[PDB]
Amino acid sequence: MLKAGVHFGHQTRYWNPKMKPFIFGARNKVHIINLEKTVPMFNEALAELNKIASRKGKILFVGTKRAASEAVKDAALSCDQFFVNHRWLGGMLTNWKTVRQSIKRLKDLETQS
RNA sequence: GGCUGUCGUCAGCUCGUGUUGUGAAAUGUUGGGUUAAGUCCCGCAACGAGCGCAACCCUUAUCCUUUGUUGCCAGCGGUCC
Ligand SMILES: [Mg+2]
């Protein structure tokens, strides 16, 4: 029917009660999201995301999780956007005004070697 | 006032921004290694920075350059030696 063979679920008994209205089933202790009803969500964050993206807005991807770090840098910066696949950093957005220094440093430094 | 002793030549002491907490405060600055060292790296709701330790000052250990007088005396002779 749908491309579900590319996955099956994850987790087990740690989960979090916050998720319940969407449970495809339960096996091997690992819970399985009810993609059968997740269909709307599978596009929801895309539709209302289109107007934003199509509006040509700065893209902010985050893949600090080593389990897919570099495996996303491409689909991000290399994809004409931004990212942070490596290791996230505190204050990057909040203490932004401060991080600028460090950021502006990796630039004016490239001219080194 | 200015000056100085004192721990202490100790590696400490802080601050701005962000964030957590009602608040007093905390974080950083804690931690894993490492160093003479807040030394360096790694990690981290922290990001950075200021005073301080590490440098430049002196001086000694070498080698060269030049300058050779009052300093020097090797090859040359002289020589009251
Ligand atoms: Mg230091």
Tab-separated table of C-alpha atoms (C1' of nucleotides) and ligand atoms in Angstrom:
chain	number	residue	atom	x	y	z
A	1	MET	CA	0.000	0.000	0.000
A	2	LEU	CA	2.356	2.694	1.285
A	3	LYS	CA	6.139	2.778	1.701
A	4	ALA	CA	6.188	1.412	5.251
A	5	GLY	CA	8.744	-1.316	4.625
A	6	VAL	CA	11.433	1.343	4.967
A	7	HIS	CA	10.742	1.234	8.710
A	8	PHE	CA	8.742	-0.404	11.503
A	9	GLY	CA	8.955	1.730	14.637
A	10	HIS	CA	11.238	2.160	17.649
A	11	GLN	CA	11.563	2.487	21.440
A	12	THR	CA	9.907	0.067	23.859
A	13	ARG	CA	9.005	0.654	27.512
A	14	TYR	CA	10.564	4.073	28.095
A	15	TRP	CA	8.293	5.930	25.658
A	16	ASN	CA	6.114	8.658	27.185
A	17	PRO	CA	2.343	8.710	27.931
A	18	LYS	CA	2.163	11.964	25.961
A	19	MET	CA	1.813	9.745	22.883
A	20	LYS	CA	-1.311	7.574	22.758
A	21	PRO	CA	-3.839	8.774	20.113
A	22	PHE	CA	-1.538	7.162	17.538
A	23	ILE	CA	-0.399	3.590	18.176
A	24	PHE	CA	-0.347	1.176	15.228
A	25	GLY	CA	0.354	-1.702	17.592
A	26	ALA	CA	2.622	-3.138	20.275
A	27	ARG	CA	5.230	-5.879	19.892
A	28	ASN	CA	8.689	-6.706	21.266
A	29	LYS	CA	7.899	-4.140	23.967
A	30	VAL	CA	8.675	-1.519	21.310
A	31	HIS	CA	5.743	0.762	20.475
A	32	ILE	CA	4.768	1.438	16.867
A	33	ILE	CA	3.265	4.759	15.782
A	34	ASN	CA	-0.049	4.347	13.960
A	35	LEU	CA	1.142	5.585	10.573
A	36	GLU	CA	-2.226	4.417	9.251
A	37	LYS	CA	-3.569	7.588	10.869
A	38	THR	CA	-0.275	9.483	10.825
A	39	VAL	CA	-0.906	10.070	7.120
A	40	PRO	CA	-2.250	13.594	7.758
A	41	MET	CA	0.784	14.430	9.891
A	42	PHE	CA	3.126	12.987	7.255
A	43	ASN	CA	2.136	15.993	5.140
A	44	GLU	CA	0.746	18.422	7.716
A	45	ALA	CA	4.218	19.684	8.640
A	46	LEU	CA	4.728	20.041	4.882
A	47	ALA	CA	1.618	21.860	3.660
A	48	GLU	CA	1.647	24.707	6.182
A	49	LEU	CA	5.420	24.392	5.779
A	50	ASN	CA	5.212	25.092	2.055
A	51	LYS	CA	3.949	28.661	2.379
A	52	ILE	CA	6.905	29.224	4.703
A	53	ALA	CA	9.497	27.440	2.563
A	54	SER	CA	8.080	28.639	-0.756
A	55	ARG	CA	8.230	32.124	0.759
A	56	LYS	CA	11.992	31.552	0.604
A	57	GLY	CA	12.665	31.510	4.335
A	58	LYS	CA	15.940	30.631	6.053
A	59	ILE	CA	16.016	26.862	6.609
A	60	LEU	CA	17.296	25.618	9.972
A	61	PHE	CA	18.079	21.897	10.001
A	62	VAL	CA	19.511	20.159	13.064
A	63	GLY	CA	21.054	16.697	12.967
A	64	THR	CA	23.458	16.803	15.908
A	65	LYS	CA	22.451	13.184	16.514
A	66	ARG	CA	25.562	11.335	15.316
A	67	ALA	CA	23.219	8.575	14.131
A	68	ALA	CA	22.698	10.787	11.074
A	69	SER	CA	24.990	13.798	11.463
A	70	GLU	CA	26.889	14.195	8.189
A	71	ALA	CA	24.119	12.119	6.619
A	72	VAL	CA	22.099	15.344	6.724
A	73	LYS	CA	24.641	18.146	6.263
A	74	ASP	CA	24.118	17.573	2.550
A	75	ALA	CA	20.313	17.603	2.567
A	76	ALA	CA	20.819	20.865	4.458
A	77	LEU	CA	23.628	23.321	3.686
A	78	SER	CA	24.593	21.382	0.567
A	79	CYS	CA	20.887	21.623	-0.260
A	80	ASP	CA	21.049	25.426	-0.197
A	81	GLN	CA	20.150	25.770	3.494
A	82	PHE	CA	21.631	25.481	6.997
A	83	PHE	CA	22.394	22.732	9.516
A	84	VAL	CA	24.203	21.617	12.684
A	85	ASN	CA	24.676	17.878	12.131
A	86	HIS	CA	27.853	17.785	14.219
A	87	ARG	CA	27.379	18.855	17.837
A	88	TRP	CA	24.657	21.316	18.811
A	89	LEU	CA	25.711	24.406	20.758
A	90	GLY	CA	24.098	26.330	23.600
A	91	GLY	CA	22.936	29.872	22.969
A	92	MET	CA	23.194	29.499	19.201
A	93	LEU	CA	19.764	31.133	18.935
A	94	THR	CA	19.072	32.620	22.364
A	95	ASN	CA	22.584	33.851	23.157
A	96	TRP	CA	22.890	34.393	19.399
A	97	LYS	CA	24.155	37.964	19.796
A	98	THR	CA	27.087	36.374	21.626
A	99	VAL	CA	27.776	33.410	19.340
A	100	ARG	CA	28.194	35.828	16.423
A	101	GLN	CA	31.744	36.518	17.617
A	102	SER	CA	32.763	32.862	17.334
A	103	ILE	CA	30.855	32.566	14.058
A	104	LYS	CA	32.341	35.711	12.528
A	105	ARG	CA	35.666	34.211	13.629
A	106	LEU	CA	35.443	31.031	11.536
A	107	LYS	CA	35.079	33.348	8.540
A	108	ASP	CA	37.787	36.004	8.773
A	109	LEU	CA	40.010	33.070	9.723
A	110	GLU	CA	39.499	30.984	6.584
A	111	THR	CA	41.910	33.335	4.822
A	112	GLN	CA	44.568	31.758	7.039
A	113	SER	CA	46.026	28.775	5.201
B	1	G	C1'	47.214	59.670	50.328
B	2	G	C1'	51.294	57.390	49.003
B	3	C	C1'	53.986	53.330	50.263
B	4	U	C1'	54.623	48.238	52.278
B	5	G	C1'	54.079	43.409	54.934
B	6	U	C1'	50.661	38.990	54.765
B	7	C	C1'	48.612	34.052	52.820
B	8	G	C1'	51.451	33.790	48.150
B	9	U	C1'	54.191	32.896	43.168
B	10	C	C1'	48.712	30.445	45.786
B	11	A	C1'	46.175	29.384	41.074
B	12	G	C1'	43.149	31.523	41.688
B	13	C	C1'	39.601	35.797	41.121
B	14	U	C1'	35.611	37.593	38.289
B	15	C	C1'	32.352	39.924	34.538
B	16	G	C1'	28.821	40.507	30.089
B	17	U	C1'	24.969	37.565	27.468
B	18	G	C1'	21.788	33.427	27.646
B	19	U	C1'	19.450	30.060	30.688
B	20	U	C1'	17.466	27.539	35.624
B	21	G	C1'	15.065	29.220	40.490
B	22	U	C1'	9.709	33.087	43.781
B	23	G	C1'	14.179	34.218	45.827
B	24	A	C1'	18.920	34.102	48.192
B	25	A	C1'	21.783	32.169	44.141
B	26	A	C1'	23.480	28.832	40.219
B	27	U	C1'	25.775	27.961	35.555
B	28	G	C1'	30.512	29.314	33.204
B	29	U	C1'	34.582	28.140	36.846
B	30	U	C1'	31.570	21.494	37.436
B	31	G	C1'	33.257	17.069	35.354
B	32	G	C1'	37.568	12.858	32.328
B	33	G	C1'	42.334	12.985	31.410
B	34	U	C1'	46.729	16.217	31.831
B	35	U	C1'	50.021	20.032	33.535
B	36	A	C1'	54.319	23.544	37.777
B	37	A	C1'	49.798	25.931	36.734
B	38	G	C1'	41.521	28.242	35.508
B	39	U	C1'	48.187	24.305	31.518
B	40	C	C1'	46.174	21.927	27.347
B	41	C	C1'	42.688	18.766	25.085
B	42	C	C1'	37.856	16.307	25.563
B	43	G	C1'	32.948	16.770	27.359
B	44	C	C1'	28.793	20.224	28.997
B	45	A	C1'	23.248	25.122	28.872
B	46	A	C1'	26.120	27.161	28.109
B	47	C	C1'	28.693	31.307	24.767
B	48	G	C1'	32.615	34.619	25.267
B	49	A	C1'	35.694	37.914	27.675
B	50	G	C1'	38.837	40.828	31.723
B	51	C	C1'	42.562	40.622	35.888
B	52	G	C1'	46.260	36.268	37.161
B	53	C	C1'	49.823	31.582	35.861
B	54	A	C1'	52.654	30.772	30.420
B	55	A	C1'	55.486	35.205	26.918
B	56	C	C1'	58.376	39.920	25.630
B	57	C	C1'	62.776	42.451	30.244
B	58	C	C1'	67.267	40.976	32.656
B	59	U	C1'	71.117	37.439	33.259
B	60	U	C1'	73.799	32.884	32.589
B	61	A	C1'	75.038	28.124	29.032
B	62	U	C1'	76.899	27.816	24.106
B	63	C	C1'	78.403	29.732	18.344
B	64	C	C1'	78.921	33.778	14.838
B	65	U	C1'	79.459	39.203	13.333
B	66	U	C1'	82.017	43.323	14.057
B	67	U	C1'	85.416	46.417	17.250
B	68	G	C1'	90.231	45.707	18.707
B	69	U	C1'	92.709	50.056	23.492
B	70	U	C1'	94.353	50.374	28.586
B	71	G	C1'	92.665	44.294	26.915
B	72	C	C1'	95.148	39.437	23.750
B	73	C	C1'	99.752	37.045	22.433
B	74	A	C1'	99.460	32.538	19.076
B	75	G	C1'	103.415	31.858	13.634
B	76	C	C1'	107.735	36.149	13.303
B	77	G	C1'	111.996	38.079	14.721
B	78	G	C1'	113.586	41.399	18.449
B	79	U	C1'	114.765	41.601	22.762
B	80	C	C1'	117.890	44.995	29.157
B	81	C	C1'	114.231	38.493	28.494
C	1	MG	MG	43.754	30.646	31.329
